[PDB]
From a paper:
High expression of PSMαs, which are four peptides of about 20-residues in length, increases virulence potential of methicillin-resistant S. aureus (MRSA).
Segments PSMα1-IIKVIK and PSMα4-IIKIIK, both of which are conserved within naturally occurring PSM truncations, adopt the canonical cross-β fibril architecture, wherein pairs of β-sheets tightly mate through a dry interface, forming a steric zipper. Both structures belong to the class 1 of steric zippers, indicating that parallel β-sheets mate face-to-face in the fibrils formed by the PSMα1-IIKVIK and PSMα4-IIKIIK segments. Proline substitutions in these spine regions abolished fibril formation of the full-length PSMα1 and PSMα4. Structural indicators of fibril stability of the IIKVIK and IIKIIK segments, i.e., buried surface area and shape complementarity between sheets, calculated from the crystal structures, resemble those of eukaryotic steric-zipper structures. Specifically, the steric-zipper segment PSMα1-IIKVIK showed a peak at 1621 cm−1 corresponding to rigid cross-β amyloid fibrils, in accordance with the crystal structure. While PSMα3 forms cross-α fibrils and enhances toxicity against human cells, PSMα1 and PSMα4 form cross-β fibrils which likely play a role in stabilizing the biofilm matrix. The highly stable steric zipper structures, forming the spines of the cross-β fibrils, putatively serve as the building block cementing the biofilm and creating the rigidity that can explain the resistance of amyloid-containing biofilms. The atomic structures of the PSMα1 and PSMα4 derivatives offer templates for the design of anti-biofilm compounds.
Residue numbers in the entry:
A (entry chain A), B (entry chain A), C (entry chain A), D (entry chain A), E (entry chain A), F (entry chain A), ...: 1 to 6
Write the structure that this text describes.
Amino acid sequence: IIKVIK
Amino acid sequence: IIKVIK
Amino acid sequence: IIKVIK
Amino acid sequence: IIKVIK
Amino acid sequence: IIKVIK
Amino acid sequence: IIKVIK
Amino acid sequence: IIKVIK
Amino acid sequence: IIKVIK
Amino acid sequence: IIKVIK
Amino acid sequence: IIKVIK
Amino acid sequence: IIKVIK
Amino acid sequence: IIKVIK
Amino acid sequence: IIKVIK
Amino acid sequence: IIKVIK
Amino acid sequence: IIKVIK
Amino acid sequence: IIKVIK
Amino acid sequence: IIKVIK
Amino acid sequence: IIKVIK
């Protein structure tokens, strides 16, 4: 599980 | 599971 | 599962 | 499952 | 399943 | 599990 | 588990 | 477990 | 367990 | 660009 | 760019 | 860029 | 850039 | 940049 | 930059 | 920069 | 910079 | 800089 916000 | 917002 | 918003 | 919005 | 909006 | 906000 | 905010 | 805020 | 704030 | 092999 | 092999 | 092998 | 092997 | 091997 | 091997 | 081996 | 081996 | 071996 990988979650990224930029 | 990969979730990305840019 | 891959979900991407740009 | 791949979902993409640009 | 592949869903794309540009 | 990896979660990143920049 | 890795969680990063910059 | 690694948690970082900068 | 590693927790860092800068 | 989306490329998938199963 | 999304590339997946299963 | 997202690349996944399972 | 996200690269995952399982 | 996120790179994971399991 | 996050790199993980398990 | 976070690097982890288990 | 965080580097961990277990 | 944090470096840990167990």
